[PDB]
Structure formats: structure tokens, C-alpha cells
Amino acid sequence: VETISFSFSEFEPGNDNLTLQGAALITQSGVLQLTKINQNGMPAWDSTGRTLYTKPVHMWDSTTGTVASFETRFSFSIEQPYTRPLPADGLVFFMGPTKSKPAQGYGYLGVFNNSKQDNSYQTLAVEFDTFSNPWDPPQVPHIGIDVNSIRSIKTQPFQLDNGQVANVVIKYDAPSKILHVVLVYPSSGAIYTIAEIVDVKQVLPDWVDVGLSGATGAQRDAAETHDVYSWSFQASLPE
Amino acid sequence: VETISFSFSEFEPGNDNLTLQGAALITQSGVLQLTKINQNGMPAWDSTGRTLYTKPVHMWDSTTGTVASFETRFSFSIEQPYTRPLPADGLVFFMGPTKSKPAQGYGYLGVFNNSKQDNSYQTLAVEFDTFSNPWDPPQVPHIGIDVNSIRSIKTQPFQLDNGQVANVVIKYDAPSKILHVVLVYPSSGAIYTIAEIVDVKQVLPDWVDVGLSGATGAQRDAAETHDVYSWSFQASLPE
Numbered sequence A, B: 001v002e003t004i005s006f007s008f009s010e011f012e013p014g015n016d017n018l019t020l021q022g023a024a025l026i027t028q029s030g031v032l033q034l035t036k037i038n039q040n041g042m043p044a045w046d047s048t049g050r051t052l053y054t055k056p057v058h059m060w061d062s063t064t065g066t067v068a069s070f071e072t073r074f075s076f077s078i079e080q081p082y083t084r085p086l087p088a089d090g091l092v093f094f095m096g097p098t099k100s101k102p103a104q105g106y107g108y109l110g111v112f113n114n115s116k117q118d119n120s121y122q123t124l125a126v127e128f129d130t131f132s133n134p135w136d137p138p139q140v141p142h143i144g145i146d147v148n149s150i151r152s153i154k155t156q157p158f159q160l161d162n163g164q165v166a167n168v169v170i171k172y173d174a175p176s177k178i179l180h181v182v183l184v185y186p187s188s189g190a191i192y193t194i195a196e197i198v199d200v201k202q203v204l205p206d207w208v209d210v211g212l213s214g215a216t217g218a219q220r221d222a223a224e225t226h227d228v229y230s231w232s233f234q235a236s237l238p239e
């Protein structure tokens, strides 16, 4: 069995295992701020940032045809402090081609280039979307399962508990081809669940980079924080 | 769309909507005790009890072939107060033939007759199993997805937070045929998830009874409480 696992109970500036892109940075307090937090402590608009684990993950064996199952968990908080305009844009966990660089920001969340489906993205992502774009369901925030497109194949509305920490659990089971996602707010006790069929051998390249990305909006104060406190990941490829 | 929903924020003695079977009873404090709690306040061994919603649920239309999606949530607590022997047996949410009566107790959880698979059960169940029987994985407690058999097609170990309230969320999405289950302990923050493919049109009769069942063990003090504090359910059959 070929495995890979990692766990960050908190983040530390200078950590060997994380690539930081765009606006993303790690605070001395141990927080990964995906998008820029200004001097005052307010989130800046027009910001996009990502982090990637430094080692690629083997998701399926192009010789035997075996497919990996994985699990990932992270805790994040989104605070929307402006009364106007509408907050934007959200954060996302993603898996895609290695040597990945940030794509477009705003509603594309630093992961996709435009709003069309393109199998060449070879990317799977689980979004926590805060702004309803032309391709989105109306309810925001929502969790979305994105397969080669920012237009989710399935979404689940969730109520934001402003500024509070949410816990996320994402599992992909290769036998069933089920990607199942859970979001829990300890603060309020709210629990949300969403699941969909994803054929990773068809969707992803055999080796992938895994990461997190966040983005704020395209106009003044269409923004919010996208802070991550911890992140663990584990994958197992049968041999 | 043919729908059915109900929600018990707490239970009330005399409620019109619940059938009580075996040892099950509702306390004036609003708790559904699936298995007998003795005078002292200790759980009795050799107890089996169930509750069923009084109205049947239409799970699939035998004329058009449409299939219902559903969601159910409940909060329960299991307290294992004896040091010896091992605690048993667990509780379960189940969906099966209407006019259902308790089956065997102990490790069969009041739902199945023996340990063999039998398509005639026409029953789907999500168990929270506390005793490792000859057909069980070794880790207990575990959540299990049971399709026409007490021998789960998939299980997920979870650590008991003794006597604490657990929140459960179960969803079945007909399009994907995915049954996805989540268990959260607010007390500790632990989150568990398990999902599997279930073809309800093949498994269940077109009309079903939905219920909860609990059982304690076959020898002195092989027991624990199986208390439920709230239960909601919602199903939608496309037309």
C-alpha cells in the first residue's frame, strides 16, 4: 500500500512542507491567512492566495489501475465584517495537476480559469462559496463539489456562523467512488453533509498536488477572512 | 412531489405519532429510553425496545419508478456504567416493511432474525454497535451500514464519549444512490463519516415504516443506556 499523510495541528512560519502562493501567509500565532488581512485587521478585497502540500500524492496507478482513497480535515473561519457590499468569494480544498499555479481569483477561487467545464483542468475541489455568481445556486454560503468546473455538480447551503471556526471532513472512498463532505460548527452545533459520485481515475492525473485556496472580491470591501487553523491529510493506494 | 416530514424536538408521553414496542418508553422528562433503565438508574440487560413513526413513507413509486431521497437526524446517548462484563449491544435507525414487529434482540438489535443475509428482510439500517459479535469488525463501538443483514457492508469505528450526547445525520440521495452518515460528539468535537451505495428500489418495499431500536445483552450487566432526545425525518418522492 502506497501511503502519504501529514497533519498540521497549527501552522508555523518557515514550515518545510507548505508552498505558499499569492497572498497566502502563516502568522506567528499559527494561522494560515489565505487572503490578505490589512493592518487594521480587516480583510482586503481583490486578494487570492493558496497553499499546497510540497509532496505530490499518488491517486491511481497507471499500471495496475488501483485507485487511492483519502481523507482530509481542516478547521477554518470566515468573518464577513462589512455591511456593504455583499461579501465574497470563498475558500476551497482542491486536488489537481502537480506544479500547480494560481488560476483566476474572485468567484473562480484561485482554481479555475473561467466558468466553463473543461476536462483538462483534471481538478476536483470542495468549495465553501460565499458569493452567488451567475453559475451559482442562490443560497450563500454553500458547500459545493466541483469536478473540472467552478459550476458545481452538487451544492448544499449552510448558514455562516460569522467569524466562528468550522470543522470540515472530506473522504473519498475508491470502491464506491463516493466523495463525502461534512461541515460542523462547534459554536452552534450545526452539521451539514453532501456527497457525490466522483470517478477520480477519469478526473485526476495519476499524481496530484493537494491544497487550499481562498479569494476575496472584485470591488471595494466585497471581502471576508479565509483563515485556516489546522489541516491533516491521509491517502492510501492499494498495491 | 410526495413528501412526509416530522420532527420531535423532545418526546412526550402520549404522543400520537409514535408506536412503542418491547421495552421502549418515553419519560416525563422527554426522553425516549429504547431499553429498560432500572429503578436505581442503571440499564438492565436482556432488554430490546423500538419506536416506529406511525405513518408509512413512500420510498419509490411502483408505477413511474421514481425514488425518494430522505434525511433523518437524531441525538442519542449511550452510557456504559459497568466495569464488567463487556457492554452490549447498540442502537440503530431502520427502514423496512410496514407493520413491523421486533425481531431478535442482543446483537441482532431488534431488527434481524439471525446473522445471515436475506433479501426478504427488505430492510436498510444504520447501526451504532457496541459489542463485537462473530460477524463484526473488532473495533467497538462502530457505525455500520446494514443492507438486508446484520453483517454490515461497511463500518467505521468511533470512540464512545461515555454518557455524552451524540448527534447523527443520515441522508439518502436517490440520484447518486448514496447513503451518507455522520456522527458528531459536541462534547469532544469528534466527527465521524461513512457512506455507501444503496439501491433502495432494489432493497426496500415501496412503502416502509421508519424507526429506532436498541438492545442490551444476553448476560448479566452486559448493558448500557440507549436514550434518544430528539428525532426528525423528511422524505421527498419526485412525481
Ligand SMILES: C[C@@H]1O[C@@H](O[C@H]2[C@H](O[C@H]3[C@H](O)[C@@H](O)[C@H](O)O[C@@H]3CO)O[C@H](CO)[C@H](O)[C@@H]2O)[C@@H](O)[C@H](O)[C@@H]1O
Pocket (backbone or CB within 6 Å): A085, A086, A087, A088, A089, A106, A107, A108, A131, A133, A134, A216, A217, A218, A219, A222
Ligand atoms: C471578473 C468577474 O468575476 C466574477 O465576479 C465577481 C464580481 O465582479 C463584478 C465586480 O465586483 C463589479 O465591480 C464589476 O462591475 O462587475 C463584475 C462582474 O463581471 O464581484 C463580486 C463581488 O462584488 C465577486 O467577487 C464575484 O465573484 C464573475 O461572476 C464575473 O463574470 C467576472 O468574471
Ligand SMILES: C[C@@H]1O[C@@H](O[C@H]2[C@H](O[C@H]3[C@H](O)[C@@H](O)[C@H](O)O[C@@H]3CO)O[C@H](CO)[C@H](O)[C@@H]2O)[C@@H](O)[C@H](O)[C@@H]1O
Pocket (backbone or CB within 6 Å): B085, B086, B087, B088, B089, B106, B107, B108, B131, B133, B134, B216, B217, B218, B219, B222
Ligand atoms: C443469543 C446470542 O446473541 C449474540 O450474542 C450475544 C452474547 O451472547 C452470549 C451470552 O452472553 C453468553 O452468556 C452465552 O453463553 O453465549 C452467548 C453467545 O452465543 O452476549 C453478548 C453480551 O455478553 C452480546 O449480547 C451478544 O450480542 C450472538 O453473537 C450469538 O451467536 C447468539 O446468537
Ligand SMILES: [Ca+2]
Pocket (backbone or CB within 6 Å): A089, A090, A107, A129, A130, A131, A132, A133, A136
Ligand atoms: Ca461563487
Ligand SMILES: [Ca+2]
Pocket (backbone or CB within 6 Å): B089, B090, B107, B129, B130, B131, B132, B133, B136
Ligand atoms: Ca454487534
Ligand SMILES: [Mn+2]
Pocket (backbone or CB within 6 Å): A127, A129, A136, A137, A142, A144, A150, A152
Ligand atoms: Mn459555488
Ligand SMILES: [Mn+2]
Pocket (backbone or CB within 6 Å): B127, B129, B136, B137, B142, B144, B150, B152
Ligand atoms: Mn456491527
